[PDB]
Design a binder for this molecule. Structure first.
Ligand SMILES: NC(=O)C1=CN([C@@H]2O[C@H](COP(=O)(O)OP(=O)(O)OC[C@H]3O[C@@H](n4cnc5c(N)ncnc54)[C@H](OP(=O)(O)O)[C@@H]3O)[C@@H](O)[C@H]2O)C=CC1
Ligand SMILES: NC(=O)C1=CN([C@@H]2O[C@H](COP(=O)(O)OP(=O)(O)OC[C@H]3O[C@@H](n4cnc5c(N)ncnc54)[C@H](OP(=O)(O)O)[C@@H]3O)[C@@H](O)[C@H]2O)C=CC1
Ligand SMILES: OC[C@H]1O[C@@H](O)[C@H](O)[C@@H](O)[C@@H]1O
Ligand SMILES: OC[C@H]1O[C@@H](O)[C@H](O)[C@@H](O)[C@@H]1O
Ligand SMILES: OC[C@H]1O[C@@H](O)[C@H](O)[C@@H](O)[C@@H]1O
Lengths: 335, 335
């Protein structure tokens, strides 16, 4: 049994990364395309064998309610559009995969969750790293007690963003700067490595407003998290440096991945009672993208809840709001 | 042409690390011993060929003023004793090398600086990393513009401390916990990699007071620094995990060392234009310890100021006070 995906928003991630990876799925198939660019519907419709009956504009998208080949809509648009397309998908009776960050605000996340609940449909956020072999290995090491209690998580995510005109640098479409786009990986990792939710947050922002990229959103916003167990995290979020890594440490040792949450190329090193050494993770059945797609499908087929549901996305936005507030107010924000 | 060192406080660092390294010095020699343990004066005096005329107790130390073979006193005691022995050394007409952290407080550092200034004698703090090959190379890459402007410094220093009864875990002798002893390397590195002084500080403390080690001083205190250029630093200080590293990053690339500030074994990796790759630093004539020793001697011989004078030690204590305050008050402390 394969559930049918409609891919909505035929941009870079949709077309270069996600759509080719239906090849390795076991419970998912590409069934429909939704785009605001007619030429893309032609181009990708022809490449992927999607008939014209299964091609939608944003104007005709609500008609997808009458298409039984579509079980799931995967929303891969700028951040500010996640909420309205998720709600429309839910009202069309479809389950929803929504890219990160879930939405611009806590309230918007709550609205999305309510819409999917009202529709009796599932909602999953695209945290692909939870399906990635090295990340799974790190999480398991922590849970097995190989490090002892988690004491520190040090995680850096950033890239040198380019074109100042792109939607990521536009507040109305992005909802925020580096934290919304790439820093969220540092936050999400601190949460899944500790398995906890933070109770206190510090942050410092640094943005050169004379830079043509940064008239509207932030460049650097680094943050600290404290967790109930006493675990701590130091996190970097940046649009002016390249980094992608984390190290989690406890009294018995530590494990790190660098790059950690990239599309490929993960490398893990660990220090666990002996010397620091490369560590190969247990093999996964398929790549993180196909695994992410199949997870939602399998949840629907078995009546289970996604491991990264709307609530996970909401929990991130809750902390993101606190990070922005901590930097704005120059004080520790309690959660 | 060698200046005479009196080593004061014949503990681990003095006897196992420093004293053997006079061997590679070009302008420094071991001339005297000062100790509160008679057996050590005998043991090390005989081992290093130091005559009884050049052996002092803490009670007879002030007599060192009449010993023309002694040019410099190197104070290698618990932190709370740095100030009185430095002042006594200064009043005995000797130049002073003092171990980090300089003293317990800003006020104590100011007193030490004033005592050496009054005596017309030089004061240097034992920041050996400034003479270590990989560290010099990282500073050079930054200075030469290899990274572009510094945007982030991420640095972690910690070790799993053991015996609860040792002076480092006693507030009266240590002046504080991990930040005084090992976290100061994170701070000092953030300062010499940026070449700047911080203007804002955040901090989070995490200490289990039920742990036998941590009845009096702190375990983890992580901190954030903002610098005037816009550069940022995320720093870890810990007594319950092992770490020793930094990465400094700018728009053009980054460079890291892990271990960064160990006695030996430094390894550098850099990302400059292409994938991260190993980098061998420019070679140094002498190891970091001998180089540190000779630096003070050479400054005295040439009438120049140490690159790590008392004001460097003071600048660290100023930030350390801010870090402790930021963690206590849960707010960004301005400097
Ligand atoms: N999990 C991951 O690893 C990644 C997740 N993402 C997430 O995917 C989403 C899209 O990112 P990416 O694909 O990089 O962005 P792109 O700009 O490359 O594609 C965005 C697409 O959204 C559609 N769109 C609809 N309305 C607008 C609008 N007003 N302005 C611009 N585009 C619009 C367009 O598709 P059409 O022309 O068909 O309308 C556009 O091509 C973001 O939420 C991002 O966070 C991105 C990269 C990686
Ligand atoms: N730069 C570096 O890499 C390092 C710097 N250090 C610094 O060196 C100093 C000492 O560290 P370490 O050598 O590890 O400490 P140790 O405990 O090994 O040596 C401390 C010595 O100081 C003397 N001393 C004087 N008064 C006291 C006292 N009241 N209680 C205990 N000892 C006393 C003793 O020597 P005696 O018996 O001769 O009186 C004792 O052996 C500290 O300031 C530390 O920060 C330490 C390690 C590395
Ligand atoms: O892996 C890095 C990628 O992560 C994505 O979630 C971000 O949206 C992209 O901007 C980034 O390039
Ligand atoms: O990191 C190596 C050493 O650095 C010193 O400055 C600290 O005092 C020691 O406690 C530590 O072992
Ligand atoms: O790491 C730098 C060091 O490498 C050593 O192998 C060389 O002998 C030293 O001359 C040099 O300073």
């Amino acid at each position: 049994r394969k559930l049918g995906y409609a891919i909505l928003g035929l941009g870079y991630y949709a077309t270069r990364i996600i759509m080719p990876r239906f090849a390795e799925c076991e419970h998912s198939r590409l069934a429909a395309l939704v785009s605001g660019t007619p030429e893309k519907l032609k181009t990708y419709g022809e490449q992927y064998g999607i008939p014209e009956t299964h091609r939608y504009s944003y104007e005709t998208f609500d008609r997808i309610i009458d298409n039984p080949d579509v079980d799931i809509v995967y929303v891969i648009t700028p951040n500010s559009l996640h909420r309205p397309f998720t709600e429309r998908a839910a009202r069309a009776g479809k389950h929803v995969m929504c890219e990160k960050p879930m939405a611009n605000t806590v309230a918007d996340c709550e609205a999305m969750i309510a819409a999917c609940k009202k529709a009796g449909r599932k909602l999953m956020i695209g945290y692909r790293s939870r399906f990635q072999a090295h990340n799974i290995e790190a999480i398991k090491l922590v849970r097995d007690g190989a490090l002892g209690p988690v004491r520190t998580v040090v995680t850096d995510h950033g890239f040198t963003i380019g074109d100042p005109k792109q939607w990521r640098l536009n507040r109305a479409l992005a909802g925020g700067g580096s934290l919304m786009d790439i820093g969220i990986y540092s936050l999400n990792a601190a949460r899944y490595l500790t398995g906890e939710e933070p109770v206190a947050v510090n942050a410092v922002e640094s943005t050169d407003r004379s830079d043509p990229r940064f008239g509207e959103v932030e460049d650097i916003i680094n943050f600290q998290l404290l967790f109930p167990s006493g675990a701590t995290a130091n996190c970097v979020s940046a649009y002016s440096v390249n980094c992608n890594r984390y190290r989690v440490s406890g009294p018995k040792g530590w494990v790190e991945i660098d790059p950690a949450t990239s599309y490929q190329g993960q490398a893990m090193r660990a220090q666990l009672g002996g010397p620091p050494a490369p560590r190969e993770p247990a093999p996964q059945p398929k790549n993180q993208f196909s695994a992410q797609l199949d997870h939602l499908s399998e949840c629907i087929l078995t009546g289970r809840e996604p491991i990264v549901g709307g609530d996970d996305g909401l929990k991130d936005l809750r902390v993101i709001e606190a990070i922005y507030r901590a930097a704005r107010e120059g004080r520790t924000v309690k959660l």
